[PDB]
Amino acid sequence: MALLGTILLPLLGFALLGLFGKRMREPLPGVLASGLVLASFLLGAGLLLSGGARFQAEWLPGIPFSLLLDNLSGFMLLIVTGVGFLIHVYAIGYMGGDPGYSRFFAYFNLFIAMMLTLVLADSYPVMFIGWEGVGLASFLLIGFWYKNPQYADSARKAFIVNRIGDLGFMLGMAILWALYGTLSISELKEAMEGPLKNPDLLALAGLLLFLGAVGKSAQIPLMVWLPDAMAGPTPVSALIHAATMVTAGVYLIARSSFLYSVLPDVSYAIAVVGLLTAAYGALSAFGQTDIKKIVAYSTISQLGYMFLAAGVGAYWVALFHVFTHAFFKALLFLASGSVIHALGGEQDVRKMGGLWKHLPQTRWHALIGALALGGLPLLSGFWSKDAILAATLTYPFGGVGFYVGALLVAVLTAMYAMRWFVLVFLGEERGHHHPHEAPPVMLWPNHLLALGSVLAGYLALPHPLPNVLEPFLKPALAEVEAHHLSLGAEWGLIALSAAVALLGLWAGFVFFQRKVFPAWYLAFEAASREAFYVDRAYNALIVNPLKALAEALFYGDRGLLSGYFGLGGAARSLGQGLARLQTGYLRVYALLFVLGALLLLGVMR
Amino acid sequence: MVVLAVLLPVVFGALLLLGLPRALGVLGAGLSFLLNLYLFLTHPGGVAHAFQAPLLPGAGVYWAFGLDGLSALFFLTIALTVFLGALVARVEGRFLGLALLMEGLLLGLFAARDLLVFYVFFEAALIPALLMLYLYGGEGRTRALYTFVLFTLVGSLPMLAAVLGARLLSGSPTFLLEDLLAHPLQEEAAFWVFLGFALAFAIKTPLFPLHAWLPPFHQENHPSGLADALGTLYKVGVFAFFRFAIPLAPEGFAQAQGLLLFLAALSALYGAWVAFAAKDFKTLLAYAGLSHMGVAALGVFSGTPEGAMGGLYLLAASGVYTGGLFLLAGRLYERTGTLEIGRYRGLAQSAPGLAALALILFLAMVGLPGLSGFPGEFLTLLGAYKASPWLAALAFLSVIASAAYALTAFQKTFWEEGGSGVKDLAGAEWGFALLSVLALLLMGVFPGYFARGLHPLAEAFAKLLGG
């Protein structure tokens, strides 16, 4: 019963800021939002320290309302609430003189409550409730500034793709209702152990769950909705790309780890899709001339990393990368938001450069972030990415090509992160920034974000050093394990990864200080800026043809109604022929009369 | 008892039609709402307020009434919807009396415990709708009226021979549903009787080939859309199917089930898809109602008590929020002067709470979890997947086009750059919005409490399709 308050607080707060909202001073809505996030973080950490929580209430027959708070659920809850409080403070800072303070922080509270509903669920229908709520809050916050059409169609496309993924989710859930009839993840796992049945249908349900997870975490093909979230304010982009709305993809697999652990083909496919998503997000990252896009594509790349980890069966490793990423990407985004608040929303890369000396603590934030993304040898991003690299080989399904693939993707993440940092802070000066570059309450939670990004790190370290995260994650869920391991050679691999990451950092440094950009690289950068022409083909054969088919069906319905009219007119015509049967000549009437009478007398036999 | 709640909207609508004033009809619809709610609460069961009175002793027709778990919440649903249409209407043409009359008629229809009285109310509800269509607006009013009315009548009149066969060929003494179900029909006669039932019940559902009346009906009514809301409450096809058609002649439904599921799937998809191509509110909502009715029909036709309860719940709630969207479109017409979707884009900044209200309503429409649609939608998905997974999947290529058309309309009406500026809200519109959002939130968060009367009826009439 007390567990419900964690969700209720940034729902009552959302209701206040939505309904009255503007009856308050400017800081007060953000203050209330951040305070509810804080006094929900605290009261949920108390429950986690009390061993766990359970809640069951009456709902749809056979589908009750079941909340389970365990190790795996609490890990996600603490991540989301902490980063949400930090981004709430950063949004109190970043939002100023902008109407709809109430709307913004009510939407923030709503987002927090919906993400909590998602992660705290013992039933797949409650998981789906949280899913659609997060999608709605994302649409709302991306379309917060409605006076611009650009920042509305973005959210529209986002939610449409999201509802595609949610329909796949629903179909998988109908499968895992027709099959078992529980739809409560706990009893569904306990019913799925042992003699599995209809393996084709089970793999199909798992595949549909993964299809939903792809739409949510912006994997291929449904990736395209994530970059346009730049339309949303920068703290919104931070919360969406780092702590929420994407992590749910990995969480669904980790909770369904019992389901996917017995689906080798499905887990292999998940690994393949994660690899391809990382490769794309990395290749199309640096060509982007906007900081928001060049960071969003890195988000896509790192989410591909996490999905590869969870696909090879390395669930706790995927969660490790989720942790490190939620730190350093929030760092990146809030740094970028402070940058564009200093330049008055310039939000460009080629219009940037030489912000090193002029910006105090922002060069430090952005550098810590870029190094965590590139995998600095002693940094959380390094530990997570390389734990993924190791779990590739150690965990089942072979990981042979996946290892070299993820290594090249790490090279590219280093290169484009260095392109980001170079082109933003170094090697020319352009524009204007007079008064105020660094604000207090934006960089203050960003300070803690840089701190956490640096020191997330060593919670999961190769087995001589303590792997604290794995024993925490394994017992609550992701129970089934089959992983080999090695020593001496594994640390040689760690050394190879660290050296390669350093080489990629300096390679990006030189290549993107260069500005030479030889013939082929210009084409490559342009292609990466245009996201490799994906939307062009999506609207060529899919979206616009669906529109034309909608119009065609409308015209077909019109013609159907016209045919109904034609039938009525045929009846009328018959009627007027029968009225023409009466000419008005008495001889005609009498002949027709005698005719009808003889017809009757014949019928009588 | 039941009959009092049934008759209260009728007498109030008469007192608005002939008597004065317009304002009294609002509180009359409210009193109907309260009594229907009171009957909904403390409800012991179907028999709750049983009523049996002599009507045609010789022929065997009696007034038979009572609140099932189905009749109770349908009473409450209709009372609420028509009360909103009474307060917010702004039509005030003195045909709010016609609206209240149609409300009472729908209440009696749902309270009908015998087949012939059910049939009588089903045919009687035509007159108010046709009037509030004809004399209170529309230029193609006469042709839309002829289309809708002639469709309903060509479907209905053979169902009289079907009910006569259902009573006579089974040796049923009366038209009471109890007796009629106590005397089931045999093969190749229940076939023809169920066919005669299914014609009218599909054309009133509506299904794909038979929906051509829905856009003409919805367009030419009074632009406020009170007539449109009451016509959407007139989509009882699913209720009739579940309560009468299938239980009375399941043998024909056994063969026709594949076809019916397919039609429901295609109706849902086609409606949700063409609604995107719709350029006006009336047509958009018409195709949306078509899609929802398709989903409900799918849920009922799947057998599957899950799907059946989902279809019935989705029916009641879709009537509710579709009538709400109709009244909202009518009020925006009264303040602006146009129902076009493209023009007058700046609304969001000018309209403080109309944006939030329309958003809540469209989200409830697209079947978002937490609002009224999703429980029925999901139960229907489950049952349809049980019956025919292929047709379930086809029918559920609907959420996409639903979100598409809903978000497109909402954005292009409200979000974009400010225009002149629009009137904010009326005092009656305030209560309309509050109560609408309250009902939507309650039916979305607690589908357990509601439909508790629906679960036994669903499982029983689905197991009736077994041995």
The count of other CB atoms within 10 Å of the CB of residue A585 is: 9
**What 3-state class would DSSP assign to A111?**
helix
Check B212 against A61: CB less than 8 A apart: no
Nearest CA to CA, how far is A309 from chain B (Å)? 31
Identity of residue B46: G
Check B150 against A129: CB less than 8 A apart: no
Check A160 against B397: CB less than 8 A apart: no
Cβ–Cβ < 8 Å for A213, A165: yes
Q: CA-CA distances (angstroms) from residue B414 to A152, A590, B252?
A: 11, 72, 49
Check B274 against A553: CB less than 8 A apart: yes
Chain A to chain B Cβ contacts (< 8 Å): 111
Question: Could you tell me which residues are beta bridge partners of residue B54?
Answer: B62
Question: Could you tell me which residues are beta bridge partners of residue A184?
Answer: A123
Interface of B with A in 421-460 (CB under 8 A): 447-448, 455
Check B381 against A18: CB less than 8 A apart: no
Torsional sign, CA A304, A308, A311, A313:
negative
Interface of B with A in 236-275 (CB under 8 A): 270, 273-274
Interface of B with A in 37-96 (CB under 8 A): none
Please choose, from the candidates A216, A277, A270, the residue with its C-alpha nearest in 3D space to the C-alpha of residue A409: A277
Cβ–Cβ < 8 Å for B184, B256: no
Answer left, alpha or beta for residue A55, where phi above 0 means left and psi between -120 and 50 means alpha.
Answer: beta
Nearest CA to CA, how far is B401 from chain A (Å)? 9
* Cβ-based neighbours of A587, under 8 Å, separated by 6 or more: none
The residue length of chain A stands at 605
Residues B440, B320: Cα–Cα separation, whole Å = 9
**What 3-state class would DSSP assign to A428?**
coil
Residues B316, B216: Cα–Cα separation, whole Å = 23
Q: Which of A146, A159, A182, A553 to mutate to probe the B interface, most B CBs <10 Å?
A: A146
Elucidated via: X-ray
Measure CB to CB from residue A163 to each of B209, B389, B400 and give the nearest one.
Answer: B400
* B150 has a chain A CB within 8 A of its CB: yes
Residues B21, B25: Cα–Cα separation, whole Å = 8
* Cβ-based neighbours of B430, under 8 Å, separated by 6 or more: none
* Domains in chain B: boundaries: 1-467
Please choose, from the candidates B160, B162, B180, B161, the residue with its C-alpha nearest in 3D space to the C-alpha of residue B171: B180
Query: Is residue A341 packed enough to be buried (19+ CB in 10 Å), middle (13-18) or exposed (0-12)?
Result: buried
Measure CB to CB from residue A129 to each of B370, B389, B455 and give the nearest one.
Answer: B370
Nearest CA to CA, how far is A555 from chain B (Å)? 9
Check A553 against B277: CB less than 8 A apart: yes
Check B368 against A60: CB less than 8 A apart: no
Q: Which of B284, B415, B445 to mutate to probe the A interface, most A CBs <10 Å?
A: B415
Measure CB to CB from residue A177 to each of B278, B382, B407 and give the nearest one.
Answer: B382
Cβ–Cβ < 8 Å for A455, A383: no
Check B273 against A177: CB less than 8 A apart: no
What is the resolution of the experimental data for this entry, in Å? 3.1
By CA distance, what is A551's nearest residue in B? B277
Measure CB to CB from residue B270 to each of A148, A174, A553 and give the nearest one.
Answer: A553
Residues of A in contact with B393 (CB under 8 A): 171
Q: Which of B378, B416, B430 to mutate to probe the A interface, most A CBs <10 Å?
A: B378
Question: Could you tell me which residues are beta bridge partners of residue B62?
Answer: B54
Q: How large is the angle between the packed helices A362-374 and A315-342, nearest 10 degrees? A: 150
By CA distance, what is A174's nearest residue in B? B382
Please choose, from the candidates A455, A304, A431, the residue with its C-alpha nearest in 3D space to the C-alpha of residue A355: A431
With an 8 Å Cβ cutoff, the interface of chain A facing chain B consists of: 18, 58-61, 125, 128-129, 132-133, 136, 139, 143, 146-149, 152-153, 156, 159-160, 163-164, 166-167, 170-171, 173-175, 177-178, 547, 549-551, 553-554, 557, 560-561, 564, 568
Check B404 against A132: CB less than 8 A apart: no
Check B277 against A547: CB less than 8 A apart: yes
Cβ–Cβ < 8 Å for A470, A460: yes
Question: Could you tell me which residues are beta bridge partners of residue B52?
Answer: B64
Q: What is the dihedral of CA A449, A450, A456, A462, to 10 degrees?
A: 150
Residues of A in contact with B437 (CB under 8 A): none
Check A177 against B368: CB less than 8 A apart: no
Measure CB to CB from residue B416 to each of A133, A152, A551 and give the nearest one.
Answer: A152
Whether a cis peptide bond, with omega within 30° of 0, leads into A471 is no
By CA distance, what is B450's nearest residue in A? A60
By CA distance, what is B413's nearest residue in A? A146
Please choose, from the candidates A483, A319, A295, the residue with its C-alpha nearest in 3D space to the C-alpha of residue A399: A483
Check A147 against B417: CB less than 8 A apart: yes
Query: Is residue A569 packed enough to be buried (19+ CB in 10 Å), middle (13-18) or exposed (0-12)?
Result: exposed
Residues of B in contact with A18 (CB under 8 A): 356
What radius of gyration, in Å, describes the C-alpha atoms of chain A?
Answer: 30
Identity of residue B369: P
Residues of B in contact with A139 (CB under 8 A): 407
Measure CB to CB from residue B277 to each of A167, A551, A568 and give the nearest one.
Answer: A551
* B188 has a chain A CB within 8 A of its CB: no
Residues of B in contact with A166 (CB under 8 A): 399
Nearest CA to CA, how far is B54 from chain A (Å)? 40
Residues A516, A509: Cα–Cα separation, whole Å = 13
b/e map B81-101, b = 16+ CB within 10 Å: bbbbbbbbbbbbbbbbbbbbb
Identity of residue B107: L
Sole residue written with tokens 């689906």: A263
What H or E segment, with its residue span, contains residue A187? helix A185-192
Check A171 against B447: CB less than 8 A apart: no
Residues of B in contact with A136 (CB under 8 A): 363, 368
